[PDB]
Amino acid sequence: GVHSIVQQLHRNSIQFTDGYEVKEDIGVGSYSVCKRCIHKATNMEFAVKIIDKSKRDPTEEIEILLRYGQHPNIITLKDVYDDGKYVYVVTELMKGGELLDKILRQKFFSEREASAVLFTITKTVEYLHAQGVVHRDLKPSNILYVDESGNPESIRICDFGFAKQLRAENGLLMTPCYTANFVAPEVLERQGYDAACDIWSLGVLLYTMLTGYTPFANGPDDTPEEILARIGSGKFSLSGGYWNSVSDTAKDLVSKMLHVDPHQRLTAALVLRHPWIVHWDQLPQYQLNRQDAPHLVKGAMAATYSALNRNQ
Structure with a gap:
């Protein structure tokens, strides 16, 4: 009490x-x-x-x-x-707008900037996960700029409205490193999953930053069934006009972050060990070849998260 x-x-x-x-x-x-x-x-x-x-x-x-x-x-x-x-x-107040939008309206954006952005966001999630917090609504619209400086120090993760503190019996707050209060291997996997969704949602962001389109939707007209169908198929283009030019390091990271099997999906820990993150200094600073359709993307993005959240 x-x-x-x-x-x-x-x-x-x-x-x-x-x-x-x-x-x-x-x-x-x-x-x-x-x-x-x-x-x-x-x-x-x-x-x-x-x-x-x-x-x-x-x-x-x-x-x-x-x-x-x-x-x-x-x-x-x-x-x-x-x-x-x-x-x-x-x-x-977040005066800087949504981060993805702003970034997609930057036509001279590079991989090197992309890695810095993901590093800052994924660092923050590694910390949350590590205290047994999961965000569970980590869609792009929930990552914002506090100002127009465009520094990674400006980045803010927002709306903690569906986030879960790994509790347990006696109403007692826990870490993922300590649950000697044996919790059901049921609601270790709930949280073990919801971690990897946060990571999947970060894969969606990285995919879209790099190409200017979302991986599972073309626009807001796309239906739930066909978006879920593509998510389930667990394949995606890492080939073609948009991708040809992107380094294999980045594509590699994307594949393992959106990996369809949660158990083989990278952790925030492992994301941050990937050479794309770690060897940022050897990434290119010249522009990406991306679709320039930010408002389409915003619709596609909303369509995607509305299909996932439908059953809830």
Whole structure:
């Protein structure tokens, strides 16, 4: 019967609208609304996610953000409130846009930049996995730039809304290195899987960065059945106008990250040992030959994640 500090936030005298001005929307959905806010005292602007407690309980999310937001490349919690009905999660606002989009509108993007981007993202996931966290919605739209600098220090992984802290009996938080509290080889494989999905979702990103098309969809018109069908077929082009020019190192990494069998799919650990990541210095800085269709890709990408999330 442990005290949770998060549960007690309705005890606060001060309210959100006492400290912050609200502005426009930026991300409406079933459970929550994301709005831009201005902090009255500082005139500093933030993102505030306004969640409905009747529709879900955002505690698991907030506890992850508290523990792991200090990570440079993880969205950072900045305030939080409870008025009874609504939880107000305040975080740094991502002014830089979605990372993939921005990158696809850069026509002189190179492999060398691609490796730096993946290194920063995969480093961050190696850390999360290592504390028995899995993201489980690591689609491109959830990886954003905090500013327009285009540094890898700008990269932020966002929306921890379906993420899972490997718990266990007695309601007790665990690592993947310690579960001497023998947990079912059932829900080691749940988390053992959901790690490798996070990695698959990173393979999709790398595929698209390199070529300017997603590997399992051409556009948003593509049907669920035919996207799932291609995912299942477990083959993909690493050949042709877009790929011809890309180094075999990169293609190799892509194959093992999107590898159809979860058990032979690379880890974040192993991704970071691949020479594409490790020997970045010997990669090319000259431009990639990519499709220039960012808005198509965004549709294709949404179509892909909507087929995967359909049954849930």
